[PDB]
Amino acid sequence: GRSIPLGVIHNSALQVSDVDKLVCRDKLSSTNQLRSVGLNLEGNGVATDVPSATKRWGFRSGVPPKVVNYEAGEWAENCYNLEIKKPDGSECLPAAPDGIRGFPRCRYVHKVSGTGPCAGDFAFHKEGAFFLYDRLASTVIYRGTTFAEGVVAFLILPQAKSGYYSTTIRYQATGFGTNETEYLFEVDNLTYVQLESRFTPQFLLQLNETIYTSGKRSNTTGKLIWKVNPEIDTEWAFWETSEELSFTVVXXXXXXX
């Protein structure tokens, strides 16, 4: 155990308030000056693609879930929403407790439906971070509820110092939360694309667009899986950044080059 840090500003710099020393110059005139705050892992430069993101979460028993609140958060580019079952059809994640709603600002909601072994009662963050929901940070993932990965801070402040769009991106998954997890991006209920880590959200929405307009959807009752060749490219984080492709049919797999 150790004291929870409190952020304070000295000499035009944020600092951890030193517990052992007393600064009478510091002023807390009201409990409004105290704030609890959620910052997203995105903003530290972590991979936000579904394959990389899910490998950070894992199932574990014997640990009761815990929840702490926060008053303010950061708009996300990438949030996740999981509907994971075992191959016997039983749910892997628990229903959202009463009062826990999805994260309020997500540009892309990565909605993953699928299956995996789920060897544990709850799904935690392997790196110790939190699943940020609407002003509640939990240690675990709730079923079918939108979350951003993140962490929490506490501050003492001084006393004087475009709309919202959201697009859902749907994924099938097998062997969720294991070494051999296979993901598929969904164009429609019969047309899919083999996922890779290098695909961005905007590439998936353009690839989708190109599939619908070019007429490359499944025109049978069968399942259609388009693979993308390694030559088609897609180290820059989100905040600092046509009909040329040709599709041919080789369940029914195929290639796009």
Partner 1 sequence: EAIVNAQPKCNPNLHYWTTQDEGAAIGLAWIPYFGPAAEGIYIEGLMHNQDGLICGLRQLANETTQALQLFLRATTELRTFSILNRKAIDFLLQRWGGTCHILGPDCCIEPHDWTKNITDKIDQIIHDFVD
Ligand X SMILES: *[C@@H]1O[C@H](CO)[C@@H](O[C@@H]2O[C@H](CO)[C@@H](O[C@@H]3O[C@H](CO[C@H]4O[C@H](CO)[C@@H](O)[C@H](O)[C@@H]4O)[C@@H](O)[C@H](O)[C@@H]3O)[C@H](O)[C@H]2NC(C)=O)[C@H](O)[C@H]1NC(C)=O
In the complex, which residues of this chain contact ligand NAG (CB under 6 A)? 167, 169, 179, 189, 205, 208-209, 212, 215-216, 219, 249
163 binds a second copy (CB under 8 A): no
**CB contact at 8 A, 217 and 224:** yes
**Cα four-point dihedral sign 185, 188, 189, 190:** negative
128 binds, among a second copy, ligand X, ligand NAG, none (CB under 5 to 8 A by kind): ligand X
Closer CB to ligand NAG, residue 29 or residue 248? 248
30 binds, among ligand NAG, partner 1, ligand X, none (CB under 5 to 8 A by kind): partner 1
Q: Which stretch binds partner 1 (CB under 8 A): 66-74, 182-190, 204-212, 244-252?
A: 66-74
**CB contact at 8 A, 86 and 143:** no
CA 165 to chain centre: 17
Q: How many residues bind partner 1 (CB under 8 A)?
A: 75
34 binds a second copy (CB under 8 A): no
Residue owning tokens 């209920």: 189
**Footprint on residues 52-91 left by a second copy (CB under 8 A):** 64
Instruction: Return d(Cα 92, Cα 44) in angstroms, integer.
Output: 29
SS3 state of residue 90:
coil
